[PDB]
Design a protein around this motif. Structure first.
Motif, PDB file in Angstrom:
ATOM      1  N   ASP A  75       7.611   1.582 -17.118  1.00 16.30           N
ATOM      2  CA  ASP A  75       8.907   1.726 -18.356  1.00 16.30           C
ATOM      3  C   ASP A  75       9.694   0.497 -18.726  1.00 16.30           C
ATOM      4  O   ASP A  75       9.958  -0.156 -19.219  1.00 16.30           O
ATOM      5  CB  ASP A  75       9.183   3.516 -18.253  1.00 16.30           C
TER       6      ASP A  75
ATOM      7  N   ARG B 161       0.020  15.073 -10.261  1.00 14.96           N
ATOM      8  CA  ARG B 161       1.214  15.266 -10.594  1.00 14.96           C
ATOM      9  C   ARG B 161       0.137  17.046 -10.430  1.00 14.96           C
ATOM     10  O   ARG B 161       1.336  17.938  -9.808  1.00 14.96           O
ATOM     11  CB  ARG B 161       1.908  15.052 -11.377  1.00 14.96           C
TER      12      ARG B 161
ATOM     13  N   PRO C 197       0.574   3.942   1.957  1.00 13.51           N
ATOM     14  CA  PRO C 197       1.202   4.410   3.316  1.00 13.51           C
ATOM     15  C   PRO C 197       2.686   3.477   3.940  1.00 13.51           C
ATOM     16  O   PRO C 197       3.416   4.114   4.088  1.00 13.51           O
ATOM     17  CB  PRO C 197       0.319   4.196   4.399  1.00 13.51           C
ATOM     18  N   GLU C 198       2.613   2.368   3.667  1.00 16.56           N
ATOM     19  CA  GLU C 198       3.768   1.646   3.541  1.00 16.56           C
ATOM     20  C   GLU C 198       4.697   2.045   2.761  1.00 16.56           C
ATOM     21  O   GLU C 198       6.313   2.148   3.733  1.00 16.56           O
ATOM     22  CB  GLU C 198       3.440   0.066   3.038  1.00 16.56           C
TER      23      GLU C 198
ATOM     24  N   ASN D  39      -0.480   1.517   9.505  1.00 10.60           N
ATOM     25  CA  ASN D  39      -1.221   0.902   7.855  1.00 10.60           C
ATOM     26  C   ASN D  39      -0.133  -0.133   8.128  1.00 10.60           C
ATOM     27  O   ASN D  39      -0.586  -1.332   7.810  1.00 10.60           O
ATOM     28  CB  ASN D  39      -1.210   1.964   6.769  1.00 10.60           C
ATOM     29  N   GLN D  40       1.134  -0.272   8.949  1.00  8.05           N
ATOM     30  CA  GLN D  40       1.978  -1.156   8.938  1.00  8.05           C
ATOM     31  C   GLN D  40       1.674  -1.717  10.018  1.00  8.05           C
ATOM     32  O   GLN D  40       1.725  -3.590   9.846  1.00  8.05           O
ATOM     33  CB  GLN D  40       3.816  -0.367   9.616  1.00  8.05           C
TER      34      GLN D  40
ATOM     35  N   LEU E  69       5.601   5.594   1.691  1.00  5.90           N
ATOM     36  CA  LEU E  69       5.277   7.193   1.978  1.00  5.90           C
ATOM     37  C   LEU E  69       6.624   7.600   2.737  1.00  5.90           C
ATOM     38  O   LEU E  69       7.297   8.929   2.400  1.00  5.90           O
ATOM     39  CB  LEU E  69       3.834   8.007   1.887  1.00  5.90           C
TER      40      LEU E  69
ATOM     41  N   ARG F  10       5.707  17.947 -17.772  1.00  7.60           N
ATOM     42  CA  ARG F  10       5.272  19.126 -17.061  1.00  7.60           C
ATOM     43  C   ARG F  10       6.013  20.255 -17.304  1.00  7.60           C
ATOM     44  O   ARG F  10       7.339  20.079 -16.521  1.00  7.60           O
ATOM     45  CB  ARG F  10       4.695  18.912 -15.834  1.00  7.60           C
TER      46      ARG F  10
ATOM     47  N   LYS G 275       0.868  -1.145   0.016  1.00  5.11           N
ATOM     48  CA  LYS G 275       0.064  -0.126   0.147  1.00  5.11           C
ATOM     49  C   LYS G 275       1.076   1.288   0.032  1.00  5.11           C
ATOM     50  O   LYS G 275       2.066   1.330   0.468  1.00  5.11           O
ATOM     51  CB  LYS G 275      -0.510   0.149   0.953  1.00  5.11           C
TER      52      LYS G 275
ATOM     53  N   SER H 185      10.976  15.863 -12.459  1.00  7.16           N
ATOM     54  CA  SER H 185      10.932  15.256 -10.708  1.00  7.16           C
ATOM     55  C   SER H 185      11.856  16.139 -10.738  1.00  7.16           C
ATOM     56  O   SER H 185      12.706  16.620  -9.065  1.00  7.16           O
ATOM     57  CB  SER H 185      10.940  13.386 -10.957  1.00  7.16           C
TER      58      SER H 185
ATOM     59  N   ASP I 210      -2.809   6.099   8.836  1.00  5.92           N
ATOM     60  CA  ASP I 210      -1.250   6.882   8.361  1.00  5.92           C
ATOM     61  C   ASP I 210      -0.387   5.654   8.119  1.00  5.92           C
ATOM     62  O   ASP I 210      -0.886   4.501   8.026  1.00  5.92           O
ATOM     63  CB  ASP I 210      -0.591   7.697  10.148  1.00  5.92           C
ATOM     64  N   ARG I 211       0.898   6.517   8.276  1.00  2.74           N
ATOM     65  CA  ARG I 211       1.652   4.791   7.795  1.00  2.74           C
ATOM     66  C   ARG I 211       1.771   3.857   8.921  1.00  2.74           C
ATOM     67  O   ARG I 211       1.613   2.825   8.710  1.00  2.74           O
ATOM     68  CB  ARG I 211       2.971   5.477   7.468  1.00  2.74           C
TER      69      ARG I 211
ATOM     70  N   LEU J 298       5.897   5.891 -12.055  1.00  3.47           N
ATOM     71  CA  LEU J 298       6.053   5.664 -14.025  1.00  3.47           C
ATOM     72  C   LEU J 298       7.073   5.370 -14.220  1.00  3.47           C
ATOM     73  O   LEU J 298       7.256   4.475 -15.528  1.00  3.47           O
ATOM     74  CB  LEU J 298       6.093   7.150 -14.168  1.00  3.47           C
ATOM     75  N   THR J 299       8.111   5.435 -14.273  1.00  2.00           N
ATOM     76  CA  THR J 299       9.631   5.370 -14.979  1.00  2.00           C
ATOM     77  C   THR J 299       9.513   4.019 -14.289  1.00  2.00           C
ATOM     78  O   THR J 299      10.475   2.459 -15.424  1.00  2.00           O
ATOM     79  CB  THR J 299      11.189   5.967 -14.662  1.00  2.00           C
TER      80      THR J 299
ATOM     81  N   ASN K 210       6.100  10.231  -9.705  1.00  2.00           N
ATOM     82  CA  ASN K 210       7.014  10.190 -11.253  1.00  2.00           C
ATOM     83  C   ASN K 210       7.648   8.203 -11.075  1.00  2.00           C
ATOM     84  O   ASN K 210       7.904   7.985 -12.532  1.00  2.00           O
ATOM     85  CB  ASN K 210       8.141  11.510 -11.191  1.00  2.00           C
TER      86      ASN K 210
ATOM     87  N   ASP L  92      14.376  10.721 -17.720  1.00  2.00           N
ATOM     88  CA  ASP L  92      13.414  10.343 -18.121  1.00  2.00           C
ATOM     89  C   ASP L  92      12.607  11.130 -16.510  1.00  2.00           C
ATOM     90  O   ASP L  92      13.244  10.976 -15.379  1.00  2.00           O
ATOM     91  CB  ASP L  92      12.849   8.765 -18.410  1.00  2.00           C
ATOM     92  N   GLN L  93      10.978  11.011 -17.256  1.00  2.00           N
ATOM     93  CA  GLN L  93      10.607  12.151 -16.041  1.00  2.00           C
ATOM     94  C   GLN L  93      11.264  13.455 -15.116  1.00  2.00           C
ATOM     95  O   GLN L  93      11.595  13.616 -14.502  1.00  2.00           O
ATOM     96  CB  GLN L  93       9.690  11.480 -14.881  1.00  2.00           C
TER      97      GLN L  93
ATOM     98  N   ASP M 265       4.338  14.293  -5.892  1.00  2.00           N
ATOM     99  CA  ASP M 265       4.386  14.114  -6.878  1.00  2.00           C
ATOM    100  C   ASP M 265       6.005  13.161  -7.102  1.00  2.00           C
ATOM    101  O   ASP M 265       5.414  12.437  -8.377  1.00  2.00           O
ATOM    102  CB  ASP M 265       4.890  15.898  -7.846  1.00  2.00           C
ATOM    103  N   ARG M 266       7.264  13.953  -6.527  1.00  2.00           N
ATOM    104  CA  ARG M 266       8.045  12.744  -6.900  1.00  2.00           C
ATOM    105  C   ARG M 266       7.796  11.228  -7.241  1.00  2.00           C
ATOM    106  O   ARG M 266       8.092  11.100  -8.163  1.00  2.00           O
ATOM    107  CB  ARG M 266       9.024  13.281  -6.590  1.00  2.00           C
TER     108      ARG M 266
ATOM    109  N   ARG N  75       1.337   0.824 -19.013  1.00  2.00           N
ATOM    110  CA  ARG N  75       1.117   1.097 -18.027  1.00  2.00           C
ATOM    111  C   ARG N  75       0.022   0.374 -17.234  1.00  2.00           C
ATOM    112  O   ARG N  75       0.236  -0.717 -16.232  1.00  2.00           O
ATOM    113  CB  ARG N  75       1.043   2.489 -17.154  1.00  2.00           C
TER     114      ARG N  75
ATOM    115  N   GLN O  57      -4.766   0.886  -2.388  1.00  2.00           N
ATOM    116  CA  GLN O  57      -5.148   2.077  -1.762  1.00  2.00           C
ATOM    117  C   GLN O  57      -3.643   2.510  -2.827  1.00  2.00           C
ATOM    118  O   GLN O  57      -3.364   3.642  -2.559  1.00  2.00           O
ATOM    119  CB  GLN O  57      -4.109   2.654  -0.654  1.00  2.00           C
TER     120      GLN O  57
END
Ligand SMILES: Nc1ncnc2c1ncn2[C@@H]1O[C@H](COP(=O)(O)OP(=O)(O)O)[C@@H](O)[C@H]1O
Ligand SMILES: Nc1ncnc2c1ncn2[C@@H]1O[C@H](COP(=O)(O)OP(=O)(O)O)[C@@H](O)[C@H]1O
Lengths: 732, 58, 46
Positions: free
Chosen positions: A578, A555, A514-515, C14-15, A517, B49, A512, B5, C10-11, A574-575, A571, B1-2, A567-568, A607, A547
């Motif tokens: 690919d 983004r 939150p695992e 979830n863990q 983030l 972007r 998930k 970021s 939160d994190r 996405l990569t 990205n 790529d991208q 946002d990062r 994707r 989730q």
């Protein structure tokens, strides 16, 4: 044409072998000629050729005794050639075996050798084995000395004496039971490779010369311990004409400081002296670790000296050095480079058929009953290495003896014959051995209730490419690798992912947002890369993202400051995908509770191209879910699951699972009452009572409001209105 | 790529590692055009972007 | 203890959620959580 299949001899004696008339013609041979036989374990003999129609073209009719002399069995391949310049023997000295000479009151030569070799005209070789019948015990003779050496024909005037030291039975047995390529199982492919890198240069060095190459001077063997690397060394020792010499890592360490180097230098000197030669180095990592991390400077010295002598040969000595290690990484990295132990072979754990062969080899000396089936044992023991299999066989024999401990008596000076002949191994012994010895999702489609179209689609996307790779290669289209599941919570999206992973028998990884983030700067993207790499390692795999809304958002717009880092994260994914276009086996399934905020770029075809809306189960699917939940619990017949499905309009699958949980909890409670009543009776109901459904349902409520559901319908209708190419037909 | 970021308008996110993102941008700026002889290194960037990318990058 | 001090999602929750989901397979270990107020704790715990 020299290759032939070992075949039985009906009437031929030991000193004569039989061939078919076409085959004997093919060799430009005459009847009664002397011939030379080469058999496994480098065993050479000479015999008299005979003509027989019963003998097959591809088979040679030949006896038991020479089979033991040639160390070959029925079906084995032996090379037969004409033997020229077979001078008549002046004198032969033969040493009989210790067991055969026992109980022979008369002289062996007079009783046995003299009538056997009277007008014999038999050609023989040093070490040749032959058998003579007579007396109270048949007598075996081994020709240790021949004059002239090596091929000599026994004329009647030739003097034969059996005096000397008779050959010990164990010494002959060890050579008879000595190892060849057949005794090693589960690595026939590796044996062929080792023959190619080692045996082939030695037999044909000019062949390597012509093509402008230098043969690999050194080879390395690596893998888990017990796989038989030293056993491969034994086999190549026995079945190679090239001179074989031993260097043992423990033996090297045994010597005093400054003497191990001496032993290895004299080792390479001896190898380059004889033509050709093979050296084997067991436990190379023991005496050749990394010089960067070494406790004693003497080990650095021995590693450096080994490097210098490794470079010492100039590819003209034609000596191949072989090394075996349990830990290849412990070996100094210099040895792995070019011009030295660059060629690596990994003896992986044996497979089912290979371990079956290993079991047969280990059990050939032991008795086997009719009931014992080695294939079953091999089937249960997925992970035992060959040494584990040998220990299993030994402890099975130990059970065989143990079951008779009540019958047998250790204090006795002699053991009973009746128990001994009753003694044998059975299936139960190998069962005990299996019990003692130590070396994908559970959810299935039958567990899920309803959503048949989604199940068929999941089978279409993932199961079909591995089922029918040829069809995909024929049409030339790469399979899709992207599935998104969007719907109200608790509708079995995780169940769908687990079911498809189980059906396709691929590793399942679920995670998930939150695992992932986290809080540090680049940590979350590193976690995403790590999870994708983990999916690659476990290929084929189903990577499940739960989730997805938390991890992937639009983004362009994010309110929070840390949302920029979010946002990062997107990205990175996405990569990563690919990179996931390369791994077709890895299939990514993303379940999102709310799909409106999901980034458009992640839903791009290529994707996550498939979008599946999982709605609330209808009446039929609710009935199916109730059936699935009540499979495990016996239920009364009065309850009507159709009525329960009809009433539970707003409930999800998780709601029904909690429903059955509470119902069977009150079933446990009434069981408490029943067992207390039983205890009172000392001083039951088979199926769930209905009042427990009555009370249990009261606890349950509606999990999801209908407004979120209509939001899901709004997203689905946006998707449907986007798909506006229904009115599409090609012209004419 | 991208590239969007690794490359951002400097000062856009205060909490992006305490300016570590801006330091990365400055390092990329120095590595592309700085006081070193240009080699045959062709740098290709892909982004969805482009308006967020640092003007000094472009 | 003091699960309410941590407390919708939160994190860390979830863990612990994933760990208890995987832990339900092992029945022998018993999981007990004492919190002062259960209103604020995540319903996924419930
Ligand atoms: N493929 C096989 N066929 C028959 N026996 C085997 C096989 N693999 C292993 N064994 C048995 O297990 C043992 C493996 O020992 P080995 O791996 O050579 O020791 P080391 O790793 O110290 O060189 C051998 O004694 C051999 O009898
Ligand atoms: N079709 C179904 N058949 C049986 N059980 C279901 C079904 N749908 C949902 N469930 C129950 O719902 C519970 C949670 O579902 P879950 O896999 O978390 O759904 P989601 O993927 O939407 O989170 C599971 O324990 C499962 O028993």
């Amino acid at each position: 044409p020299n290759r032939l299949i070992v075949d039985e001899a009906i009437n031929e004696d030991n000193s004569v072998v039989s061939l078919s008339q076409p085959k004997m013609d093919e060799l430009q041979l005459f009847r009664g000629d002397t011939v030379l036989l080469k058999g496994k374990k480098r065993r050479e003999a000479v015999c008299i050729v005979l003509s027989d129609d019963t003998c097959s073209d591809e088979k040679i009719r030949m006896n038991r005794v020479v089979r033991n002399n040639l160390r070959v069995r029925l079906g084995d391949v032996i090379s037969i050639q004409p033997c020229p310049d077979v001078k008549y023997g002046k004198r032969i000295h033969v040493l009989p075996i210790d067991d055969t000479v026992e109980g022979i009151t008369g002289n062996l030569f007079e009783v046995y050798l003299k009538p056997y070799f009277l007008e014999a005209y038999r050609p023989i070789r040093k070490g040749d084995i032959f058998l003579v019948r007579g007396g109270m015990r048949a007598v075996e003779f081994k020709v240790v000395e021949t004059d002239p050496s090596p091929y000599c024909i026994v004329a009647p005037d030739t003097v034969i004496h059996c005096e000397g030291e008779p050959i010990k039975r164990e010494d002959e047995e060890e050579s008879l039971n000595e190892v060849g390529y057949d005794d090693i199982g589960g690595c026939r492919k590796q044996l062929a490779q080792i023959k190619e890198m080692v045996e082939l240069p030695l037999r044909h060095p000019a062949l390597f010369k012509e093509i402008g190459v230098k043969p690999p001077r050194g080879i390395l063997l690596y893998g888990p311990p017990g796989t038989g690397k030293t056993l491969i060394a034994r086999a190549v020792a026995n079945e190679t004409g090239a001179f074989f010499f031993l260097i043992n890592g423990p033996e090297i360490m045994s010597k005093l400081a400054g003497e191990s180097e001496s032993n290895l230098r004299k080792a390479f000197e001896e190898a380059e002296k004889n033509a050709p030669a093979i050296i084997f180095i067991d436990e190379l990592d023991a005496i050749a670790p990394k010089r960067e991390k070494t406790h004693g400077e003497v080990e650095r010295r021995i590693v450096s000296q080994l490097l210098t002598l490794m470079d010492g040969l100039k590819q003209r000595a034609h000596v191949i050095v072989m090394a075996a290690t349990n830990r290849p990484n412990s070996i100094d990295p210099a040895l792995r480079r070019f011009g030295r132990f660059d060629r690596e072979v990994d003896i992986g754990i044996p497979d089912a058929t290979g371990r079956l062969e290993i079991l047969q080899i280990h059990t050939k000396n032991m008795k086997l009953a009719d009931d014992v089936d080695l294939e079953q044992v091999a089937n249960e023991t997925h992970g035992h290495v060959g040494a584990d299999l040998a220990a299993l066989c030994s402890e099975a024999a130990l059970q065989a003896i143990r079951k008779k401990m009540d019958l047998i008596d250790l204090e006795d000076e002699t053991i009973d014959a009746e128990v001994m002949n009753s003694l044998a191994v059975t299936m139960d012994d190998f069962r005990w051995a299996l019990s003692q010895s130590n070396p994908v999702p559970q959810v299935t489609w039958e567990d899920i209730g309803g959503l048949e179209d989604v199940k068929r689609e999941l089978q279409e996307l993932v199961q079909y490419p591995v089922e029918h790779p040829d069809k995909f290669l024929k049409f030339g289209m790469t399979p899709s690798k992207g599935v998104l599941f969007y719907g109200p919570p608790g509708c079995g999206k995780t169940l769908l992912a687990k079911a498809i992973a189980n059906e396709c028998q691929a590793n399942f990884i679920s995670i998930k947002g939150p695992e992932l983030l986290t809080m540090w700067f680049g940590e979350s993207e590193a976690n995403v890369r790590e999870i994708f790499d983990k999916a690659r390692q476990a290929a084929p795999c189903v990577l499940f993202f739960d989730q997805l809304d938390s991890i992937a958002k639009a983004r362009g717009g994010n309110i929070g400051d840390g949302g920029g880092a979010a946002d990062r994260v997107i990205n990175q994914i996405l990569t990563e995908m690919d990179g996931m276009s390369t791994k077709k086996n890895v299939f990514i399934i993303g379940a999102t509770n709310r799909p409106d905020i999901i980034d458009p770029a992640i839903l791009r075809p290529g994707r996550l191209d498939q979008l599946i809306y999982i709605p609330l189960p209808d009446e039929k699917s609710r009935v199916a879910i109730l059936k699935a939940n009540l499979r495990k619990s016996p239920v009364a017949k009065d309850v009507d699951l159709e009525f329960l499905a009809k009433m539970t309009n707003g409930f999800s699958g998780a709601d029904l699972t909690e429903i059955c949980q509470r119902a069977c909890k009150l079933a446990i409670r009434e069981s408490i009452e029943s067992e207390i009543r039983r205890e009172r009776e000392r001083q039951p109901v088979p199926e769930i009572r209905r009042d427990h459904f009555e009370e249990a349902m009261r606890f349950a409520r509606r999990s999801v409001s209908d407004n979120d559901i209509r939001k899901y319908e709004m997203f689905a209708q946006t998707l449907q209105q986007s798909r506006g190419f229904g009115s599409f037909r090609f012209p004419s």
